Design a protein around this ligand. Structure first.
Ligand SMILES: Nc1ncnc2c1ncn2[C@@H]1O[C@H](COP(=O)(O)OP(=O)(O)OP(=O)(O)O)[C@@H](O)[C@H]1O
Ligand SMILES: Nc1ncnc2c1ncn2[C@@H]1O[C@H](COP(=O)(O)OP(=O)(O)O)[C@@H](O)[C@H]1O
Ligand SMILES: [Mg+2]
Ligand SMILES: [Mg+2]
Lengths: 469, 498, 47, 53
């Protein structure tokens, strides 16, 4: 079918069809563009007009430009040939390496798995990060969230996870960069090429990348998440194998949805958000799931505007996640990195019957001591440390040691700290915290525990501190 | 006599050609927005012209009329006027011909001084460079402020943000950065020369005149462009000035050269865009800003790239300036731009009045590049300085034992070391010398009220007696063992002799 | 509107910084004492 | 000295609690004003968006 642009307002294009209309969500191709501009149908306005969001700049469009109707939603190339490549929302490659030569094209819009496909099994995923493993342990096939404002460590933490889990992970992996700095996209491309997960020579690449960075118009940011999700879904089903899926950030999907809603004629909701915030986010987060045919481990970075965890976007995202690790700025100011908040992070598998009674009891003891420390900090602001009950000073000392011991040096944060990355096995973290609580270290100074791996490294650092005293 | 001769020279060459052009009738003009009827083939965000020679942009393409924004005054456009489409997306002149010229948002010379001899035009609304052209930020962008070059370093291709309240010293940092580049631009190698662009958005013409004369006094217009869209310029001009300046800098970065652009402020481009959008009748959003207010900036700051050596190797640094309200960094535009940019430089009034100038809040100021994009000498010294101030800031709220007393002493010495004046940026080696003297326990003997006296006298002494050592540090780009021993003996001698 | 534990240091006003410093000075002192004791034990346990 | 010191500490704490109570009253009034203003602002934004279609 052939139609005809009749209006262009910002990123929203109104296209008139003389023949039969195209169904909602179909992709239309504008005729007369040097590059490829794809509009996606979003509404039928009557009188044969259809409103659409453009997946590219709408500059140089002329009222009357002919438009072709592809007849299907945006179909991206999928398969093992996309690994090691980069893609747009519309699937064309942006790595300047030639066409993606696949036999399968998958539409980016699909129904979520039905209730009779859900897996109900959970087993810890050991990431090698002390705070994550202890207080908010992850789970294979579960959806992970990384909340936090700007400048707290979301990108560094997600890069660290790619460094650990993806490098030593047999299955494939997908990284969908949604509305993030292009500098970071290039940095990740080159870091992956260096590590070897992306191999430009052979066909041994283990990562497929999709990029919708923040220079793109809202239409492309609102759909690059679906493109990455489609690649991951194919690797889940047809390949019948484990998959990882990293997204950064999944707040730009919501925000990009909000930048066009007012132009599509919808009244806004609570805080300048589209009325369809929860439904639009659900119809996407419900395809990132571990069905009985495959298994997607989804890590999502979620911008929290102005550190406000009660904003509608993060507030709604909370309900779609198994594990959450709420990075906190108030802890990043103290220099504790990663700034994961131990009291504001949770996991579903954090039960004594899934992790064990020792792990669970250590975690709960740590959380309780930190909460007691918070209670005491109010009193110390008036009395002073010198006036506390000789038992309270013990609580404060243990709490500060535990606060420092959760900090850890990453292998990707060598540039900032200059230290060396450490991977701490789960048993070592449990032992370290159980000992710190039990009092077996109430003589070593606090700073001995700052930015070290297992507890023995803290002992060695304390020994060095004493020798050069 | 020759005055009239050169007058005639202009007429002698005219535009005889009259062409058959598409047109439209202004159905309604008011508040700076015209609703043309016709222009059936006008493109989106194309440039149209009015019967009086006044330009405009076709921003809205509705089925029945085209919503045009007028790049200038609006009293001269009547109903039933004629709008001729120029058939060209909005574009601005670019080239080295613009250096030293004050121009308006559309690239028209504003200081007299004749016209611009630009041979090339570039579209304001160009897409940012892809993921492949770029390359990680390598070189350092020398700002001249000790506290910025040491604690929050800026590379070339980075996008720092200078965010603060009104009258905390943001434009001062911008001008110091512009002025400092004089030493590099005067030299010979072209790999260090950095051409500066200053976009002045919403600033009253008096402020821009003061700024231009300040640059002229420091002889810094040889390489500076000033794109002024002042308060009295219609909103469609203040909305477009950042993009014009960014195109003028995109030319440099695309031709293997390095450029620095300073949008000042972006919080006023946001207001101009809001006015435009509200007068085109587009529905408002949060705080009345349109929905596309993040895009507005993200598409603009994403053009500050660092091209790899295959694409010339050129770079374009950006230093957007935001203005918060009573330190409410949590506002809408501040948070958008903070989540867009790489680093930040927080200026605080409580620090401005407490005597710390520049008010840079080193506790919160960040720079993702950090380690990279810092000279080896500065990397060596500023690291220990950063640790010392980090420890000092913890125990600072009060004012016993020798260890913590000396920790506070060192912190205070370093703090008074970081202060600075206006329009007197320092060479990097001089900054290294001062910071080395301060951080190696030398100033711990002096009083903290005399540290400025030291800093100044030490600089004056070294700049003459030990020019050779500074040249060594600059050329070799590190504090070698022999250089360290020298520095040691110079500082030890000078301290006692003062 | 209620109040919760650990709120004095959440506001970050004057009391927050005052409390942070009152804690840091004390624990720097105790760390110094413990490091001295650790050095003494190191020396006394070489043989 | 200890008797007088304990008496003085009791008096000082009582006065500090009284001052904190006055400050709490003032801040509660300010908080209520700000909460109402925020409700009104958000509602007016919604109304303007709805009527500006
Ligand atoms: N390093 C400094 N030393 C002394 N004074 C300074 C310094 N930096 C800024 N000032 C003073 O601060 C005042 C405001 O400077 P500046 O214009 O840079 O701030 P601003 O925030 O850009 O102002 P506005 O936002 O109102 O344009 C100036 O009058 C100047 O005297
Ligand atoms: N593990 C870490 N160690 C030290 N510093 C870190 C760490 N993670 C993040 N940072 C700090 O945060 C900055 C990067 O933050 P980033 O995570 O990229 O921002 P966001 O989380 O908002 O995307 C760096 O400049 C660095 O100083
Ligand atoms: Mg990030
Ligand atoms: Mg200013």
């Amino acid at each position: 079918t052939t139609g005809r642009i009749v209006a262009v307002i910002g990123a929203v294009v109104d296209v008139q069809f003389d023949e039969g209309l195209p169904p909602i969500l179909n992709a239309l191709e504008v005729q007369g563009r040097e590059t490829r501009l794809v509009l996606e149908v979003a509404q039928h306005l009557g009188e044969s007009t259809v409103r659409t969001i453009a997946m590219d700049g709408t500059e140089g469009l002329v009222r009357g430009q002919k438009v072709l109707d592809s007849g299907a939603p945006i179909r991206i190339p999928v398969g093992p040939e996309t690994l090691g490549r980069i893609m747009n929302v519309i699937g064309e490659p942006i790595d300047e390496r030639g066409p993606i030569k696949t036999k399968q094209f998958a539409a980016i819009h699909a129904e979520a798995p039905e209730f009779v496909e859900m897996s109900v099994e959970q087993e810890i995923l050991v990431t090698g990060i002390k705070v994550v493993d202890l207080l908010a342990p992850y789970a294979k096939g579960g959806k992970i969230g990384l909340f936090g404002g700007a400048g707290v460590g979301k990108t560094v933490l997600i890069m660290e996870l790619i460094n650990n889990v993806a490098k030593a992970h047999g299955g494939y992996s997908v990284f969908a960069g949604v509305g993030e700095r292009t500098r970071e996209g290039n940095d990740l491309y080159h870091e992956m090429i260096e590590s070897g997960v992306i191999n430009l020579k052979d066909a041994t690449s283990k990562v497929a990348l999709v990029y919708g960075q923040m220079n793109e118009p809202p239409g492309a940011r609102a759909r690059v998440a679906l493109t990455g999700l489609t690649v991951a879904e194919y690797f889940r089903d047809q390949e019948g194998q484990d998959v990882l899926l990293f997204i950064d950030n999944i707040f730009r999907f919501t925000q990009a949805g909000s930048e066009v809603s007012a132009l599509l004629g919808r009244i806004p909701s609570a805080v300048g958000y589209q009325p369809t915030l929860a439904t639009d986010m659900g119809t996407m987060q419900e395809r990132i799931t571990t069905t009985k045919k495959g298994s997607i481990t989804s890590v999502q970075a979620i911008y929290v505007p102005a550190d406000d965890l009660t904003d509608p976007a993060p507030a709604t995202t909370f309900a779609h996640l198994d594990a959450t690790t709420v990075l906190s700025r108030a802890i990043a100011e103290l220099g504790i990195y990663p700034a994961v908040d131990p009291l504001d992070s949770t996991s579903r598998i954090m039960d004594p019957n899934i992790v064990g009674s020792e792990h669970y009891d250590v975690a709960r003891g740590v959380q309780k001591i930190l909460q007691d420390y918070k209670s005491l900090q109010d009193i110390i602001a008036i009395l002073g440390m010198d006036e506390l009950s000789e038992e309270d000073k013990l609580t404060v000392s243990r709490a500060r040691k535990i606060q420092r011991f959760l900090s850890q040096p990453f292998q990707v944060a060598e540039v900032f700290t200059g230290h060396l990355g450490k991977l701490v096995p789960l048993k070592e973290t449990i032992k370290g915290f159980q000992q710190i609580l039990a009092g077996e270290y109430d003589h070593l100074p606090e700073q001995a525990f700052y930015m070290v791996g297992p507890i023995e490294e803290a002992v060695a650092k304390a020994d060095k501190l004493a020798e050069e005293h | 006599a020759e005055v009239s001769s050169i007058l005639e020279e202009r007429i002698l060459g005219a535009d005889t050609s009259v062409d058959l052009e598409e047109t439209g009738r202004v159905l309604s003009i008011g508040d700076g927005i015209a609703r043309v009827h016709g222009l059936r083939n006008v493109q989106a965000e194309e440039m149209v012209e009015f019967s009086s020679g006044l330009k405009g942009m076709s921003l809205n393409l509705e089925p029945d009329n085209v919503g045009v924004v007028v790049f200038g005054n609006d009293k001269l456009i009547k109903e039933g006027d004629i709008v001729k489409r120029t058939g060209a997306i909005v574009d601005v002149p670019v080239g080295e011909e613009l250096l030293g010229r004050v121009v308006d948002a559309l690239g028209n010379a504003i200081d007299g001084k004749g016209p611009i001899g630009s041979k090339a035009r570039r579209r304001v609304g160009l897409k940012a460079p892809g993921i492949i052209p770029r390359i990680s930020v390598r070189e350092p962008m020398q700002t001249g402020i000790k506290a910025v070059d040491s604690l929050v370093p800026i590379g070339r291709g980075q996008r720092e943000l200078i965010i603060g309240d009104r009258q905390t010293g943001k434009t001062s940092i911008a001008i110091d950065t512009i002025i400092n580049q004089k030493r590099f631009n005067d030299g010979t190698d072209e790999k260090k020369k950095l051409y500066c662009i200053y976009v002045a958005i919403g600033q009253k013409r008096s402020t821009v005149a003061q700024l231009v004369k300040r640059l002229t006094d420091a002889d810094a217009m040889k390489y500076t462009i000033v794109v002024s869209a002042t308060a009295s310029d219609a909103a469609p001009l203040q909305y477009l000035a950042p993009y014009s300046g960014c195109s003028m800098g995109e030319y440099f970065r695309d031709n293997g050269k390095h450029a620095l652009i300073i949008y000042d402020d972006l919080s006023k481009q946001a207001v101009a865009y809001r006015q435009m959008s509200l007068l085109l009748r587009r529905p408002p959003g949060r705080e009345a800003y349109p929905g596309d207010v993040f895009y507005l900036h993200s598409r603009l700051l994403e053009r500050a790239a660092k091209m790899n050596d295959a694409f010339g190797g050129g770079s374009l640094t950006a230093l957007p300036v935001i203005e918060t309200q009573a330190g409410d960094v949590s506002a809408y535009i501040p948070t958008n731009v903070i989540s867009i940019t790489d680093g930040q430089i927080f200026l605080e009034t409580e620090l401005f009045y407490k005597g710390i100038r520049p008010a840079i809040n080193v506790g919160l100021s960040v720079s993702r590049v950090g380690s990279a994009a810092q000279t080896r000498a500065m990397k060596q010294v500023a690291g220990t300085m950063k640790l010392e101030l980090a420890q000092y800031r913890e125990v600072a709220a009060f004012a016993l034992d020798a260890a913590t007393q000396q920790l506070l002493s060192r912190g205070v010495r370093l703090t008074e070391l970081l202060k600075q004046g206006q329009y007197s940026p320092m060479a990097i080696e001089e900054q290294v010398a001062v910071i080395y003297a301060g951080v190696r326990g030398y100033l711990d003997k002096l009083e903290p009220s005399k540290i400025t006296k030291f800093e100044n006298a030490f600089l004056s002494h070294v700049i003459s007696q030990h020019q050779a050592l500074l040249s060594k540090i600059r050329t070799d780009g590190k504090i070698s063992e022999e250089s360290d021993a020298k520095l040691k003996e110079i500082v030890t001698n000078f301290l006692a002799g003062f | 509107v209620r109040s919760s534990a650990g709120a004095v240091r959440d506001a970050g006003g004057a009391f927050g910084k005052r409390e942070q410093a009152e804690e840091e000075r004390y624990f720097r002192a105790r760390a110094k004492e413990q490091l001295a004791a650790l050095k003494k034990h190191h020396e006394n346990e070489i043989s | 000295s200890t008797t007088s010191e304990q008496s003085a500490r009791m008096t000082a704490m009582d006065n500090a609690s009284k001052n904190a109570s006055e400050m709490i009253d003032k801040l509660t009034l300010t908080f209520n004003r700000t909460r109402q203003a925020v409700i009104t602002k958000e509602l007016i934004e919604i109304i303007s968006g709805a009527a500006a279609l």
